[PDB]
Amino acid sequence: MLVPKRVKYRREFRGNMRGRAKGGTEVAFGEYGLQAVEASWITNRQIEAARIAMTRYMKRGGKVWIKIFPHKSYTSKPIGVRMGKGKGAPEGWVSPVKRGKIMFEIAGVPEDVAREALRLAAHKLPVKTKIVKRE
């Protein structure tokens, strides 16, 4: 699973996800891509599952791109611990995706199997998506 090799600080703020995507709002590498319509956090587990289900249908033919990466980390507390006494220990890694950001790319396959592969990927992500193509 995609994790950073090392980080400067182990703890980070939750942040916010308001506004349009700063960059990457268009397809540049492949010819089809999944575009987010809403905004939500995407963990690294959902990136992996949406990728195996995406290359398995393509039978390992053609190249896919991952346009997002889980830079930020989040923490959690055990059950039975009261509030306070510091901060929790990190658990996973997330990538806050604002609306209008392409998350995947497809090239090297015909029209029929490009849309179907993207369709199976979208069902594993918690955001409402749309299949978009280049020009």
- Residues near another protein (CB under 8 A) are 85-87
In sign, the C-alpha dihedral spanning 58, 59, 65, 67 is positive
Contact call for residue 6 and RNA (CB under 7 A): yes
Query: Measured between alpha carbons, how far is 13 from 135 in angstroms, rounded to an integer?
Result: 38
φ/ψ of 75, rounded to 5, equals: -115, 170
111-122 and 44-55 helices, crossing angle to 10°: 150
* In the complex, least distance from residue 124 CB atom to RNA, rounded to whole angstroms: 15
Contact call for residue 1 and RNA (CB under 7 A): no
For another protein, the closer of residues 56 and 87 by Cβ is 87
Helix (H) or strand (E) holding 48: helix 44-55
Footprint on residues 57-96 left by RNA (CB under 7 A): 63, 65-69, 71, 82-87
User: What residues line the site for RNA (CB under 7 A)?
Assistant: 2, 4-13, 15-24, 28-29, 38-41, 63, 65-69, 71, 82-87, 126
